[PDB]
Amino acid sequence: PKPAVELDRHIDLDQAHAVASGGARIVLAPPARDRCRASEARLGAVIREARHVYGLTTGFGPLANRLISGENVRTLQANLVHFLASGVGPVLDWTTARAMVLARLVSIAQGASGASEGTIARLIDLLNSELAPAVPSRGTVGDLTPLAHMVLCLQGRGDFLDRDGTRLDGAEGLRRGRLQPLDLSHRDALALVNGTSAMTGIALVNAHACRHLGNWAVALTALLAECLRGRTEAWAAALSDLRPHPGQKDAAARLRARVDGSARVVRHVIAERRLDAGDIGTEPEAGQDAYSLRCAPQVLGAGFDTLAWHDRVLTIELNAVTDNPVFPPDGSVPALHGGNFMGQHVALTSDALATAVTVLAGLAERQIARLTDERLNRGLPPFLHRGPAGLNSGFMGAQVTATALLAEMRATGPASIHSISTNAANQDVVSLGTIAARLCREKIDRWAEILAILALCLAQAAELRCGSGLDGVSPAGKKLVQALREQFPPLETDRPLGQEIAALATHLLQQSPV
Amino acid sequence: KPAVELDRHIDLDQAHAVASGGARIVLAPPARDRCRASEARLGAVIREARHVYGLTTGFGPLANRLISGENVRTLQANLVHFLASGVGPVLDWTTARAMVLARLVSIAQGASGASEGTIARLIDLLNSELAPAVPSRGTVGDLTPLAHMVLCLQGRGDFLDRDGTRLDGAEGLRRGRLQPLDLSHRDALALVNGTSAMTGIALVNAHACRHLGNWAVALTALLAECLRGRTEAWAAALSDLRPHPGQKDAAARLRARVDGSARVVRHVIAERRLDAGDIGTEPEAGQDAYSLRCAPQVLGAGFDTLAWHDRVLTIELNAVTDNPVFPPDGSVPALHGGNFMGQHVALTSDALATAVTVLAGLAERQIARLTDERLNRGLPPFLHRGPAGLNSGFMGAQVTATALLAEMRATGPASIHSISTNAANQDVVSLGTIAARLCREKIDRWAEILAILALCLAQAAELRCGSGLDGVSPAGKKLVQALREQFPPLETDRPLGQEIAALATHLLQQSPV
Amino acid sequence: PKPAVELDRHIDLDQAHAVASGGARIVLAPPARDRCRASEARLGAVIREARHVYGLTTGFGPLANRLISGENVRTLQANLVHFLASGVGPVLDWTTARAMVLARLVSIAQGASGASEGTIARLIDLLNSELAPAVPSRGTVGDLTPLAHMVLCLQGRGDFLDRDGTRLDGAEGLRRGRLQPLDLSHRDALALVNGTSAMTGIALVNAHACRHLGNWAVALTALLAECLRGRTEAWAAALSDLRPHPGQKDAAARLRARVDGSARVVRHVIAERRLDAGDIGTEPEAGQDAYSLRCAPQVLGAGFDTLAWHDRVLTIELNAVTDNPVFPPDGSVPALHGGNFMGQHVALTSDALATAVTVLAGLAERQIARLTDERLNRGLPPFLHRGPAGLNSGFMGAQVTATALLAEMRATGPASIHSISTNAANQDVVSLGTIAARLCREKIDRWAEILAILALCLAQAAELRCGSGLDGVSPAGKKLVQALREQFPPLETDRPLGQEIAALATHLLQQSPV
Ligand SMILES: O=C(O)/C=C/c1ccccc1
Ligand SMILES: O=C(O)/C=C/c1ccccc1
Ligand SMILES: O=C(O)/C=C/c1ccccc1
């Protein structure tokens, strides 16, 4: 009884990802079907009336001053798909390519693109099938190129990808997924090759992954506190109220919940202690933890607020019409020409999220560095090894790997600042939003690997500190370690961890600890 | 002079008004009462000898060294001393005062324990025409700059007059009619705490960005009047189809700027029905290049980034970023945490810096298009006057704008460079102050790029429409006439460096109205 | 009759790539064999005499303060390979992985590593086979991790790669390659897990690719001049002599040779012309070309000088011993402990080269932008299309793709500046050389794609300007276009170019236009 998302006007990010990931099927609501039929009729009229419209009676880009006779429009649009198919590089992953198709569909569903029923049906069919078009990730300045490749795929002139990433030729794809070859006879090619569908698709996948990684970041910080006698007073709600950033209040509340029931953290407020002359001297530990624990609400919180902004902007973009030209539903004018395809919004939010992800990955990396340092981990074995010290190095290698992954993340900055005048100066400013979204994705993948290493370290640390029975560990903490131990054995002796790290990271990106 | 009464909340405009000296500041009775209550709570915490950071402990990782009451004044005096290791150019007058204001707003919430005298010193500084002279570098995000502020307020550091001229501490206290700061109440941590510096810098960035954004819109509009731009791309209907608040706002403001103009193209091209005889190559395309057609989308994305930045900053400015803190409700004697972690300002400052660089890029490309004889539709190359060749007009200024932009691009986000420090106690740091400062530098470059565009447009408007500016919108005419009051037309090549600099200074503080 | 490289002490970059790419077999010269046999004996003596030596009588990293008894050394070194195998990410390509193996071998050949005959034989056998170890590209801060994975592969406990990148399991690899399983019973594991072999291997492949791409950059700049009536006086030897940078002098000489025999370039020195009163006015074109042509010697030259520096440093690194500890061949002391494994040299040169590659890619991108712009290409069709204008857009899509590739290159900066204290603060400074070399490689790949687009554009532009017969085109220019036309047909009508761009890019990275 696979869930179904009925698309009318608005779709939220979770619904969008459910469809893109194949978790839910999609259906076009009757009201939307009618709006599209109405827009299809407007396109037909615009064409019959020989209105001066980009892509219907003109060339493309700077060549738009070259008018085209009606008799040659099917050729014009066929060549459009052709000359735009210059993409190169690895193909977008299965879920992301599907998210791109969904983004184009949501835009069309608003009823201002003139797409024909058949065209809309082909997109819905793809989304309801187990396939995804195989489209190169590079080539656009922000998303005609990847969309042109999508068109070729839907016509059976390009490869398809199954859930595993294995490619099928065009014919096989249409066959296996029961897809009908795309037919652009209605001259509605610009309804498919238009907008910010690719960057939006990539960004929606980034948004979903960050939600899960954010949950792990919280869960692991909480478990870290249980392994290092962390002080919970730094996570007090009263502190959040004094500096009311939503993301911070949320992070602190979630951290408190994770360690609820723990007998391993320090819950005493230090100021409750009254000192006398005999207390004046040097104590073993300071009354507050290092920042990787004490400032977690503030660091994680800032990241959560960046994601919140990113998602607010993305929700608007996903449900908008980023086409050019557009055909006003009210019929005020035959069509409007502008630049709603300029993806500066997703470009700027992706760059911002990328920075936030790098910052949070840095936190996890430092948490690993502290947990594995015998001089800072308050009594735990160096690098959390088991067996004789020296002969065994435990997580010593994995710890450096986390640092290496972080260092690589830092080498890449915002994509948005690199606009270069192109297309014979017609596109004198470009968003590079697709690139921005892809760079953010890479950082998200690195962050998952760093968190994976931290998770494996914590599972081991929890047992070293509290015994295999995890005595004193919170219910949430126990469940997380027990779940990890179902697939990842304790490190009783040194062994290669690379494959386990990669395996766990893939899981972190798709599911939260609950 | 207007007065801003500070109770609990203050908006960014009120904050800048006080920081810039445009308005006096007064602490509302309710705020004074809350602060007196907090002062009393600190007194009790001290009398009770509660274990509290900075009152009974050393600092940083040295907090494990407990301190006896008789030594606390020395302890807090040393705190200010060892933290005063800042270097680099001092913060400008307005920004330094904004930092003072930020600390005051935090204290006014009533959880810092600041004494009436300490609060009075901050208010006095803000009501005077002076600013403390504080080095800009040294903090990983803001004890160092605040420590320097304290030294200045005690007359042990320099002050800055509105012009930036420095005065020694003693002279500063006398000229500003300020009394030396006295921390005998052991309330030093009420002054050396939080995110005051980055917040002060960021609020000045916010104000400057609002003005530059107004200029970016006004100059884009005037560009359209000089290049026969098509207004249909700025139609509200398009905004409604892609409802980003910033984009809708940008488009509306653009339309308003060109209202009444006879120099722009208002025809919707799809209205035209083509005949077989029209098929061929026409003189111009039916749509403009992106620097005009996509202005709503580019400026809009920038405006939405600034809106996010401002929402976050408003919360930070009105929050208590202190540590430790003394709960007004008396639930516990004090709370220890990390509200001083400036990650929020760090991330928003970096995000804004990117948006600023993007928008400066748009302005830079608009100059490049306007001054190009192959692209400016009939205007002289580089908008020169007099004999061509003999005169190059704005040819130099155009390259200078490109140079300014290229420089902006060389600097990226500051937040990603966290480095474990303070003997690993501060294993993660925000670098928020650095982030806000880097954003300020890009903002200054953007102002210079816009200044160049404005001078180019004033010349272009006259070359296209004559000195009378025939067909130019009322807003466009008013803008050019205003500029012409201080900046003469370029009838023959002349040095523009000083004019560009002077105009940029203006753009940062005032909008085209 | 497959060539053979006899390794004694020194090997140049060309010989190294010849072996790494499988173009030549490798053999150890008699003196090298003897130096290695002697070093092997020295390691035996060190063990026999129970000398305090890292990895032989101590734990690893900060754990080196834990001394180890002789009977546990086999286990110690076995665990070393284990805990270090935490690598993740896509495996290094066939040639690069083998280049890494070669790098370790050359270091060992200096006779200060103590590697046994068998160990050396395993490396040689690998290089003389058609296989490469499958090693993850990420994990090192600069190269124990990737080398540990190498060891596992050589023992038949890790995958292998054939020339096509198809993976084989350990067993299949040893079988298909007719290889013997690596046996570290002599306790010479540190002879394999040591040094800067990975970054050096990666960098030597970057060096080879940049030489070819550099040749294409020159050839295409020259052809561009023949398509736009470029002035050769800007490339005069006299100018080079006035600003004697080696790279510039060479670039200018190579550019002149490429257009030798051309009737399509302007060779007249403008200053020879004497002007009269009737000449004063506005001429159609300026007396000098735009920078993308006029400043080619200077821009290409600076890039070539950067590559020259990179190669000088790399040559030293490749032929050096970057191991720790080391066993002095002169027998002065049993062993020396230091940090010759710190890859700061490769890190800084890789970062410098990466910057130069981005700059040169920028030149190529602007050359494409100028050539396709009807307002700047002096009479050529917009975007070099054929067929009716507007209906056909030619390379309009490819041109934007080139811009997108360049913008993405610019988003990534130097890797070296991101050092982070790790390994419980033992490694308080790290080089990140491997990452730097990898980032440089990605940029080289992007540069090749951009050059490929420019090459396709120039082939079309040359025929459009000079006819299919290429009348007036230099002999070198004709040969290049004709060579390209053998595999890439003219663009008579718009068609997808993505796959062709990628195919040509692969070719440009391995062969120069000759
Ligand atoms: O001016 C436009 O709206 C179209 C630009 C463009 C650029 C490259 C390929 C196709 C269209
Ligand atoms: O841990 C804290 O709250 C204090 C840190 C610190 C570090 C350097 C100087 C002053 C305070
Ligand atoms: O001090 C050294 O030379 C060794 C460091 C090290 C760090 C991580 C893994 C293995 C060795």
DSSP assignment of C328-356 equals -TT-SSS-B---TT--HHHHHHHHHHHHH
Q: Give counts: helices (H), strands (E), chain B.
A: 17, 7
Resolution (Å) of this entry: 1.9
Burial of B252 (0-12, 13-18, 19+ CB in 10 A): middle
E strand or H helix at C46: helix C30-48
Residues C320 and C341 sit within 8 Å (Cβ to Cβ): no
Instruction: Give the C-alpha separation, B41 to B18, whole Å.
Output: 29
Q: Does A51 touch chain B (CB under 8 A)?
A: yes
Both A206 and A345 in a single domain?
Answer: yes
String of DSSP letters for B450-505: HHHHHHHHHHHHHHHHTTTTTT--HHHHHHHHHHHTTS---SS----HHHHHHHHH
* Atom 9 of ligand 2, residue of closest alpha carbon: B60
Please give the C-alpha separations between residue C298 and each of B289, C249, C305, C447, C458, in angstroms, as whole numbers.
33, 9, 10, 18, 22
Q: Mind telling me how many Å the CA of A104 is from chain C's nearest CA? A: 20
Instruction: Give the C-alpha separation, A46 to A382, whole Å.
Output: 74
Amino acid at A493: T
DSSP B157: S
What burial letters (b/e) apply to C265-290, b meaning 16+ CB within 10 Å? beeeeeeeeeeeeeeeeeeeeeeebe
Scan for tokens 């309804």, then name that residue: A191
DSSP B91: P
Q: Does C506 touch chain A (CB under 8 A)?
A: no
Q: How was this structure determined?
A: X-ray
Both B266 and B150 in a single domain?
Answer: no
- Cβ count within 10 A of residue B471: 17
Q: Does B481 touch chain C (CB under 8 A)?
A: no
* C191 three-class SS: helix
Instruction: Give the C-alpha separation, A373 to A400, whole Å.
Output: 12
Q: Which of C63, C144, C407 sits opposite A390 (nearest CB)?
A: C63
Angle of the A396-410 helix axis to the A433-466 helix axis, nearest 10: 160
Residue among B462, B11, B455 at smallest CA distance from B215: B455
Instruction: Give the C-alpha separation, B318 to B341, whole Å.
Output: 15
Residue from A421, A427, A428, A429 to probe ligand 1 pocket by mutation (most atoms less than 8 Å from CB)? A427
Residues C461 and C484 sit within 8 Å (Cβ to Cβ): no
Residues C177 and C128 sit within 8 Å (Cβ to Cβ): no
Please give the C-alpha separations between residue B256 and each of A191, B151, B221, B231, in angstroms, as whole numbers.
31, 50, 9, 11
Ligand nearest to the CA of C194: 3
Residue among A267, A225, A304, A261 at smallest CA distance from A479: A261
Residue among A91, A95, A89 at smallest CA distance from A163: A95
Of B194, B214, B232, which residue is a domain's last? B194
* B87 three-class SS: strand
Instruction: Give the C-alpha separation, C395 to A83, whole Å.
Output: 7
Chain C, 425 to 444: residues with Cβ < 8 Å from chain B are 425
Please give the C-alpha separations between residue C364 and each of C239, C262, C357, C368, in angstroms, as whole numbers.
22, 21, 11, 6
Both C161 and C251 in a single domain?
Answer: no
String of DSSP letters for C457-510: HHHHHHHHHHTTTTTT--HHHHHHHHHHHTTS---SS----HHHHHHHHHHHTT
Instruction: Give the C-alpha separation, C184 to C192, whole Å.
Output: 10
Residues in chain B closer than 8 A to A106 (CB atoms): none
E strand or H helix at C4: strand C4-7
Q: What is the CATH number of the domain that holds B142?
A: 1.10.275.10
Residues in chain A closer than 8 A to B331 (CB atoms): 238
Reduced 3-state DSSP string for C198-255:
HHHHHHHHHHHHHHHHHHHHHHHHHHHHHHCCCEHHHHCHHHHHHCCCHHHHHHHHHH
**Ligand 1 atom with the shortest distance to the CA of B290:** 1
Q: Mind telling me how many Å the CA of A414 is from chain C's nearest CA? A: 6
Instruction: Give the C-alpha separation, C458 to B52, whole Å.
Output: 74
Q: Which of C138, C401, C496 sits opposite A405 (nearest CB)?
A: C138
String of DSSP letters for B342-392: THHHHHHHHHHHHHHHHHHHHHHHHHHHHT-TTTTTTPPGGG--SSBTTB-
Both C13 and C71 in a single domain?
Answer: yes
Residues B218 and B458 sit within 8 Å (Cβ to Cβ): no
Both B199 and B184 in a single domain?
Answer: no
Both A253 and A152 in a single domain?
Answer: no
Structural domain of residue C395, as residue ranges? 196-514
* A419 three-class SS: coil
Cis peptide upstream of residue A381 (ω within 30 degrees of 0) = no
What is the β-pairing status of strands C136-138 and C167-168?
unpaired
DSSP B244: -
What is the β-pairing status of strands C160-161 and C167-168?
antiparallel
**Ligand 3 atom with the shortest distance to the CA of C62:** 1
Phi and psi (nearest 5°) for A161?
Answer: -120, 145
The half-sphere exposure of B411 on its side-chain side, counting CA atoms within 13 A, is 23
Q: Does B277 touch chain A (CB under 8 A)?
A: no
Please give the C-alpha separations between residue A28 and each of A155, A180, A254, B74, B360, in angstroms, as whole numbers.
22, 18, 37, 74, 42
Both C270 and C144 in a single domain?
Answer: no
- Count the domains in chain A: 2
Both B35 and B85 in a single domain?
Answer: yes
Q: Mind telling me how many Å the CA of A174 is from chain B's nearest CA? A: 33
Asked if A389 and C68 come within 8 Å (Cβ–Cβ), the reply is no
Asked if C418 and A425 come within 8 Å (Cβ–Cβ), the reply is no
Closest CA in chain C for residue B374: C375
What is the β-pairing status of strands B3-6 and B24-27?
parallel
Instruction: Give the C-alpha separation, C370 to C365, whole Å.
Output: 9
Among residues A13, A25, A33, A54, the one annotated as catalytic is A54
Q: Does A97 touch chain C (CB under 8 A)?
A: no
Beta strands in C70-191 (DSSP E): 88-91, 132-133, 136-138, 160-161, 167-168
Asked if C412 and A411 come within 8 Å (Cβ–Cβ), the reply is yes
Phi and psi (nearest 5°) for C487?
Answer: -120, -20
Residues C359 and C299 sit within 8 Å (Cβ to Cβ): yes
Ligand nearest to the CA of B291: 1
B329-334 long-range contacts (CB < 8 A, ≥24 apart) are B330/B41, B331/A238, B332/A238, B332/A269, B332/A271, B332/A272, B333/A269, B333/A271, B333/A272, B333/B41, B333/B44, B333/B45, B333/B48, B333/B50, B333/B52, B334/A269, B334/A271, B334/B45, B334/B50, B334/B52
Among residues C54, C291, C309, C341, the one annotated as catalytic is C54
B290 carries an active-site annotation: no
B422 C-beta closer than 6 A to ligand 2: yes
Q: Does B47 touch chain C (CB under 8 A)?
A: no
- Give me the residues paired with residue A51 across strands: B273
Instruction: Give the C-alpha separation, C83 to C341, whole Å.
Output: 19
Residue among A438, A454, A436, A468 at smallest CA distance from A508: A454
Both B220 and B99 in a single domain?
Answer: no
DSSP B232: G
Maximal C-alpha separation, chain A:
98
Q: What is the B128 CA–ligand 2 centroid distance (Å)?
A: 32
E strand or H helix at B132: strand B131-132
Both B104 and B201 in a single domain?
Answer: no
Both B321 and B204 in a single domain?
Answer: yes
Q: Does B374 touch chain C (CB under 8 A)?
A: yes
Of B143, B165, B194, which residue is a domain's last? B194
Q: Which two tokens stand for residue A38?
A: 């109405």
Both B78 and B34 in a single domain?
Answer: yes
Among residues B5, B36, B53, B137, the one annotated as catalytic is B53
Please give the C-alpha separations between residue B402 and each of B453, C355, C395, in angstroms, as whole numbers.
11, 20, 28
A58 C-beta closer than 6 A to ligand 1: no
Of B194, B225, B242, which residue is a domain's last? B194
Q: What is the CATH number of the domain that holds C365?
A: 1.20.200.10
Instruction: Give the C-alpha separation, B252 to B263, whole Å.
Output: 18
A430 C-beta closer than 6 A to ligand 1: no
